Amino acid sequence: GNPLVYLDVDANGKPLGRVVLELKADVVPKTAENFRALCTGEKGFGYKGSTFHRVIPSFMCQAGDFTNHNGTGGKSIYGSRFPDENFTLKHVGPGVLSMANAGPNTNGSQFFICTIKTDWLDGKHVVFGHVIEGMDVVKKIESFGSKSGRTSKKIVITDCGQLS
Ligand SMILES: CCOC(=O)CNC(=O)NCc1ccc(N)cc1
Numbered sequence: 001g002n003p004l005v006y007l008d009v010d011a012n013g014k015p016l017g018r019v020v021l022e023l024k025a026d027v028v029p030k031t032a033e034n035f036r037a038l039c040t041g042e043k044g045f046g047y048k049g050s051t052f053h054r055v056i057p058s059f060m061c062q063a064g065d066f067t068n069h070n071g072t073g074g075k076s077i078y079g080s081r082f083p084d085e086n087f088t089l090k091h092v093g094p095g096v097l098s099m100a101n102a103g104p105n106t107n108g109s110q111f112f113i114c115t116i117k118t119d120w121l122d123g124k125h126v127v128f129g130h131v132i133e134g135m136d137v138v139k140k141i142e143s144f145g146s147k148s149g150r151t152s153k154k155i156v157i158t159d160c161g162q163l164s
Helices: 029-040 135-143
Strands: 004-011 014-023 052-056 060-063 096-099 111-114 127-133 155-162
Touching: 004 029, 004 135, 014 029, 014 135, 029 127, 029 155, 052 135, 052 155, 060 135, 127 135
Parallel strands: none
Antiparallel strands: 004 014, 004 155, 014 127, 052 060, 060 111, 096 111, 096 127
8 A cells, every 4th residue: 555664864963763654645646656766765866865954843844855955956756846746635734744846836856744734835735645653753853943944953864765
């Protein structure tokens, strides 16, 4: 059924633990598959060694720019960008996993994990998964953010892959 993938996260070289995510391939197969392949690194590129570059407490933690490392870059397994698959899943609460974008139909590799219900993003960002285990690790990441999004520690995805 749905893939389970993981992100192991460090803050200034000290391990925070693991985040496990279910990808909703039953609802958004193209979006799920992109994220899965970027966790395994099987196309020759992916999230390993990239950072959470924008973290805003009581909102979300954002990551996945492995080309420019600053929120301008990243790419998908299909090309630079790919379309909004559908908006069937909603931002219902903490732990929701959703695609970052620069407007309609600009999905790449950047993603965010919500730390509250972000209902005003419904219809604008494609929801494609949720946190199964490791919300404590996410709350730690959140604690290193600020209003501007700047992080007070370097937060690195030191390893990632597929569990099933
Ligand atoms: C809570 C979600 O906040 C955003 O997504 C704000 N946008 C954002 O950082 N946009 C930069 C960006 C550039 C290229 C791609 N592919 C994706 C994103």
